[PDB]
């Protein structure tokens, strides 16, 4: 769905983030909801990575490997490089422990 | 790692 030109968190346009400063929105490819990266708390390089991809918001995000949410969707990991979501049991290899700190998905890792 | 839960709280709520 086409982007909603308003940030879901601060209701500002791309012309006024929470600091009343211009900042382009990220927009969910599935539901069209948008957010300023500053409002989403994304770091700059995550932001520039997400801009080049088909991004889903937190609520729309399905696991990139198995393509479902499922009953334990709240514990799906988000890639610190690309914001893709992965269930623990769908990681490479499947994880039985929640990673502490930075985690990067299989899509972003080198071949 | 960031999860759907940590991200949702990290941002705070959507505007009502
Ligand atoms: Zn905002
Ligand atoms: Zn969405
Ligand atoms: Zn999965
Ligand atoms: Zn990634």
What labels describe this entry?
A: 111 residues, little secondary structure, Herpes Virus-1, two-stranded antiparallel ribbon, two-stranded antiparallel sheet, elongated, B: 16 residues, 12% strand, binds zinc ion, Histone acetyltransferase KAT6B (chain A), Histone H3.1t (chain B), transferase, DPF, acetylation
Order of strands in the sheet with most strands of chain A: 1-2
Number of strands of chain A: 4
Q: State which percent range the strand residues of chain B make up.
A: 5-15%
Oligomer type: heterodimer
CATH superfamily membership of chain A: Zinc/RING finger domain, C3HC4 (zinc finger)
Q: Give the biggest sheet of chain A.
A: 2 strands, antiparallel
Taken from the alpha-carbon principal axes, the silhouette of chain A is elongated
Q: Structural class of the secondary elements of chain A?
A: little secondary structure
Q: What is the succession of H and E elements of chain A?
A: EEHHEE
What does it look like?
Chain A: This is Histone acetyltransferase KAT6B. Chain A: Belongs to the MYST (SAS/MOZ) family. The complex is a heterodimer of chains A (111) and B (16). By secondary structure, chain A is largely without helices or strands. Chain A has a single domain, classed as 2-Layer Sandwich (Herpes Virus-1), CATH 3.30.40.10. Chain A has helices spanning 37-40, 44-51; strands spanning 26-27, 34-35, 77-78, 85-86. Chain A has a two-stranded antiparallel ribbon with strand order 1-2. Chain A has a two-stranded antiparallel sheet with strand order 3-4. In chain A, a hairpin with a 6-residue loop joins strand 3 and strand 4 (85-86). Chain B is an alpha+beta fold and 16 residues long. Helix content of chain B is 50%, strand content 12%. Chain B contains one helix and one strand. The radius of gyration of chain B is 8 Å and the shape is elongated. Strand 3 (77-78) of chain A pairs antiparallel with strand 1 (2-3) of chain B. The structure holds zinc ion (4 copies).
């Amino acid at each position: 769905m086409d982007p909603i030109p308003i940030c879901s968190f601060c209701l500002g346009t791309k012309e006024s983030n929470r600091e009343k400063k211009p900042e382009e929105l990220l927009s969910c490819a599935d539901c069209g909801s948008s957010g300023h990266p500053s409002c989403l708390k994304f770091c700059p390089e995550l932001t520039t990575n997400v801009k080049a991809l088909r991004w889903q918001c937190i609520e729309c995000k399905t696991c990139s490997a198995c393509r479902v949410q499922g009953r334990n969707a709240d514990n799906m990991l988000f890639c610190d490089s690309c914001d893709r979501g992965f269930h623990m049991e769908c990681c490479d290899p499947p994880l039985s422990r929640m990673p502490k700190g930075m985690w990067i998905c299989q899509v972003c890792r080198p071949k | 790692a960031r999860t759907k839960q940590t991200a949702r709280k990290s941002t705070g709520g959507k505007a009502p």
